[PDB]
Amino acid sequence: KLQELDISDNKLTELPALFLHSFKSLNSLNVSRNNLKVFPDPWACPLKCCKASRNALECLPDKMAVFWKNHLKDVDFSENALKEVPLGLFQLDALMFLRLQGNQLAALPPQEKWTCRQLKTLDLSRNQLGVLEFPAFLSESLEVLCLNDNHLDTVPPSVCLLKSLSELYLGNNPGLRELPPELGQLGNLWQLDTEDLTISNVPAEIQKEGPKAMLSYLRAQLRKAEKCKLMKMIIVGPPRQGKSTLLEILQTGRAPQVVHGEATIRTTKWELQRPVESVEFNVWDIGGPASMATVNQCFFTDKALYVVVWNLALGEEAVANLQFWLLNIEAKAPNAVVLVVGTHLDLIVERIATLRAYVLALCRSPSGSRATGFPDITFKHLHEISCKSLEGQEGLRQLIFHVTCSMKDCQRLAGRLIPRSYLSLQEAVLAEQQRRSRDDDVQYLTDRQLEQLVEQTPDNDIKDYEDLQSAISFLIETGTLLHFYFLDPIWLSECLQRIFNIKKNGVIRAEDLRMLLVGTGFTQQTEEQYFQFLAKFEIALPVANDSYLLPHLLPSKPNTIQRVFKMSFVPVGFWQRFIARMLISLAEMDYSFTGNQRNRCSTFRVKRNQTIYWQEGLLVTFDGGYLSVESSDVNWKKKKSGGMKIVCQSEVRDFSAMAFITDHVNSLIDQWFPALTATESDGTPLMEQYVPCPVCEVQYFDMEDCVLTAIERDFISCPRHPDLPVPLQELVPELFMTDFPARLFLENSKLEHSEDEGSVLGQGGSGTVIYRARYQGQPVAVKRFHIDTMLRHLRATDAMKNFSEFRQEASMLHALQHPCIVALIGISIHPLCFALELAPLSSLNTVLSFIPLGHMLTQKIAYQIASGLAYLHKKNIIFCDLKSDNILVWSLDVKEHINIKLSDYGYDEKVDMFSYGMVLYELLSGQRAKKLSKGIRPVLGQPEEVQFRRLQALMMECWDTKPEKRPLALSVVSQMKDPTFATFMYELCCGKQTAFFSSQGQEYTVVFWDGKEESRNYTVVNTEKGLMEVQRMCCPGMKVSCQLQVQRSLWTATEDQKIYIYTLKPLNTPQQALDTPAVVTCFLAVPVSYLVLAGLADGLVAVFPVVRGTPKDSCSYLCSHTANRSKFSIADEDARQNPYPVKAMEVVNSGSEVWYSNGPGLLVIDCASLEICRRLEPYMAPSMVTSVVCSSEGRGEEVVWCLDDKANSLVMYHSTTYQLCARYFCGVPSPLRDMFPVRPQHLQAVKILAVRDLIWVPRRGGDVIVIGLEKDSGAQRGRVIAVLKARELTPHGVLVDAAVVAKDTVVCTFENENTEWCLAVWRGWGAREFDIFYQSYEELGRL
Ligand SMILES: Nc1nc2c(ncn2[C@@H]2O[C@H](COP(=O)(O)OP(=O)(O)O)[C@@H](O)[C@H]2O)c(=O)[nH]1
């Protein structure tokens, strides 16, 4: 009978196993920490775990899989005296964890006879086990395998098959000398113990790098990896500097006779032998007109040899121009090697040294180290040649070959091992490109087509995403494949140039552009692809009325704050891209959460009245202001350079417009012109920012100084008049927030703030720190942001970035006013921080058998989370991190309106819904991942155990694998606004059975009966657990027509007029058999030590006194017809005296009366004298009463309800006056929120139930009408509080019965035409629970 046995730290050598065998109820067997020598022989008991560690057990019996095969999962016999392992221990299906560590096991049983398909952890370390032979099936289950200090002379052959391992520990096996290549296939394995092992097949360097490098190298061995000598080389430089001439000299080795004509990109395959003894270059001669200067940069890739061609005789301006190219290469190809090669050497001795000094000054800072943002140029990377005499040609070739063999990833590029499958894919892609070129086909290759290529390739072992991605990176490195996948750079260049050759005001209608684009084929079936990459390069962007804006076709040139940006050099087409991006963003104007790099321009929301865009400027007239940006020529420190003059006029000091430009400028300079992010070799920025002095009126404040002062102070004094300071608000109104309402700003004098580690509540995704603080005495969460000429520049950049991020976060937080979203109290600049409302309790992950928080609280939490998500998605905001860490618990009180709030501190909508499903799993379970990407989901118990079928089903859908099937947050919110969602617990399929019975107890909660005569049997359902404790236990005898439970005795009245009594201790042997004059049709127990009344089929009532559950064989007979004739003067001919059976009885008036049916009438038995004293006429013949209940609950008058069979009518009397004070029709097709007064086939009701305060009327249709009484203007009335209907029971037939099995449970039992029975379990909500449920939605709607 015992469930948990804990024998530990005691005098245990011999265990009374026979005594333990009686414990059939055990779930945990713990005999650990003893000197146990004889483990008890296994027995039938549903053990979940078997802890027998730290004892003297030497051997086990072959009986684990005889009794515990289907129950026992956790076994740990570790650190014992074990010598032999039974075969049966591995024959347990339920086994998932096994520990046989620290003993004298020498061999394992044959693998063919194992059954433990669920074995996930197996530790055989510290043993003499040996080489061993593991089963194959363990590959699909095992996650942890450890064999440390085993009798192994090699890796077991089966370890290579164990694809599912995450840990593999085989240390201290000195006989092992090999790690076979197939272990590389263990892709899921990242924890390894190869200590004390010899590895002859792995280099020492690979071992030093680690077991991860070992697995990678073994994979390389398996894939027959070959040494590749192919690398990308790119010629770049200013136009007409001899790029084609230089390449011709390099390839031919002669004075050029044919130089290539006009072209943007040309390609060739150049082969060199040593002056791993050869190399091959996929040479891309990149040239073209000046208009391609900032488009060609897309073709620059990493781990490639760049040759910047430079005209030596042109002068110093050429060397200065080289900075542009060098910055571009270092920005796009950080790990590339750059050589600067000089031509026109025939036009020049010391001049060469001077020019080399100039170039070396460019690449290196004054300190001599590598300048930031430049490639590593040195004396080895410089060379000069001529175009006729070929001087230095051989030296140049030697330089190329030497640099190529020097570049390395781990070893040198020229000869690195690549998997053979990667080379096979390279051949396949080259074949595809060649075929498309032959067929004049679109050279753009779709991802599906590349997958088809890699799979279609013979014996290509690329079978997963990571392999294909690595192969893609390799292909990009060798100039075979291009991505921004493209196969032909020349075709792309031709397409872009042809678009550039088009000659409106920059906007062309989509159809006109489609016909114009016909030159490069432009297959309409590929148009969606084609236009896509047109948008990628910003060559033709979709705008307005399904038109396309063409930046190269922009027209020419047709109180306040001002800004200036000084540019040393203007990139070609910078203005076009800038104006196009601004114009498109404004046209859009007419997000994320929890911190990320993803965000939109939420900073600027105004009505654009007029817009004037042109080749080098944009003027925007918006309601209450102007925003203009123009080209200009700036002069500072007598340095004249290009410039961007920006002006804004705001009537209300709303200078958010100056953010809109500035952010965009930064964005553009970060995306397409990274050259302008960098500084010269001496630290001078290539693009500087300036603010004209408004009080000096030209004098310009350096924007870095204004920003750095804005961190702490408010004023700056100009050098021309230091005694007359200017506030920063007239210099940088962007940073000092002015657009926000005045109410939104915190008062530093009323804010108790301190960046104390003890008050740290957490961190955000943007790099902030959230502390606990006080504002005006109330607790709050304060999110604080945190931040030599080079150090000053870096700090200024960081400060500007933080101010922009603060602006964006404030803009998004200001727009969320939903009750379930953490609001914003206010902002402040000194210090730069947010103030937010603080949760009295910690996050949901911290407060958290099943449903730990309770049903109602879990329901409210889930609904409020869903409502918050629906609101966020209504604002086009995505949470992106919807974990329980970020979900703050406001209160665990069920009565409160708001319980949780969604925070940003501790894609599209489908990922949010997925994370919501995970949160629901945690809510139902109490706990809780790469396997999620593979279709593996966390496991939750069945509905019979969870007991919340609808939320569990919702959680399954939220965790679905196809995003298309997942629900929208609004749909979840809408379907949760329904009492069916909350009340239904689960369903239980009992199956084929005959009759249903219940009793006011828990020993015989729900009892079904089936069978006939010798085959009579019964089933018991434990609805509290959803488990059937007895299933068709046979108790031969007559079938039971009625059943009751009194004290601890079950009375059952059969069809042969016999009341049998079974005393519980199995209803096998009755103790009493009582005779009756007619078949019992109903039972009741009056609490008098009881008085059991039996309503017989003839309308007569039998009365049995009961003493402690045992009655007297004699009984009294109270005749209803006798009372009708004698007391109440009803004639025999009256229909009221027809032979009706007693259908339902009920106690009323605290046991002093019993109301029981008699045809359409009702009779009252007065318990004082056991006589029929009152009659009531709720209905008329031939109708009959079918149920009676006593709604004796609440601070009010006791009332008695009565249902009917024909009229389908409900009536209610007062128990103390017998006045028919209410009548209602229950056959209402749409009964929701109906009403009736009180005066002080599928629509047929089955049986009334009294659930706490309310009256549940189930109907054959399967739904339930939950009627309850209230008062209006002093008059009592009744209303239909809620109509429940579980859809899951639709195919389970018709409702037959219903019964209140416990205080908080209502069991409605359905039967189908095939004699099968099915229970539907509802939570027995009273009036207060329903009102709380409804108010949870009504109030949040109101708020
Ligand atoms: N004198 C001299 N002329 C050169 C040299 N390299 C190229 N050229 C001239 O440049 C022309 C070809 O330039 P090209 O290679 O097409 O420049 P790219 O378009 O940038 O590749 C030829 O007509 C040559 O006369 C050189 O080293 N010395």
Residue numbers in the entry: 381 to 510, 539 to 683, 690 to 762, 768 to 828, 835 to 909, 920 to 938, 945 to 999, 1012 to 1043, ...
Please give the exact wording used by the authors of the publication that reports this structure.
Leucine Rich Repeat Kinase 1 and 2 (LRRK1 and LRRK2) are homologs in the ROCO family of proteins in humans. LRRK1 and LRRK2 have a similar domain organization: an N-terminal half containing Ankyrin (ANK) and Leucine Rich Repeats (LRR), and a catalytic C-terminal half containing the ROC–COR ROCO signature, followed by the kinase and a WD40 domain. Despite their shared domain architecture and involvement in intracellular trafficking, their disease associations are strikingly different: LRRK2 is involved in familial Parkinson’s disease while LRRK1 is linked to bone diseases. LRRK1 and LRRK2 use different mechanisms of autoinhibition, with LRRK1 having a second level of autoinhibition absent in LRRK2.
We purified LRRK1(Δ1–19), where the N-terminal 19 residues, predicted to be disordered, were deleted, and imaged it in the presence of Rab7a, ATP and GTP. Most particles classified as monomers, with a small subset forming dimers. The monomer particles yielded a 3.6-Å structure of LRRK1(Δ1–19). In contrast, the LRR of LRRK1 is shifted towards its WD40 domain, leaving its kinase’s active site exposed. The only interaction made by the LRR domain with the rest of LRRK1(Δ1–19) is a contact with the kinase’s C-lobe. The kinase domain of LRRK1 is in the open, or inactive, conformation with its DYG motif (a tripeptide involved in ATP binding) ‘out’. Even though the overall conformation of LRRK1(Δ1–19) would not prevent a Rab substrate from being engaged, we did not see any density for Rab7a in our LRRK1 map. This could be explained in part by the presence of an autoinhibitory loop extending from COR-B into the kinase active site, which we discuss below. An unusual feature of LRRK1 is the length of its kinase’s αC helix: it is approximately four turns longer than is typical in kinases. The extra residues pack against the COR-B domain through an extensive hydrophobic interaction that is unique to LRRK1.
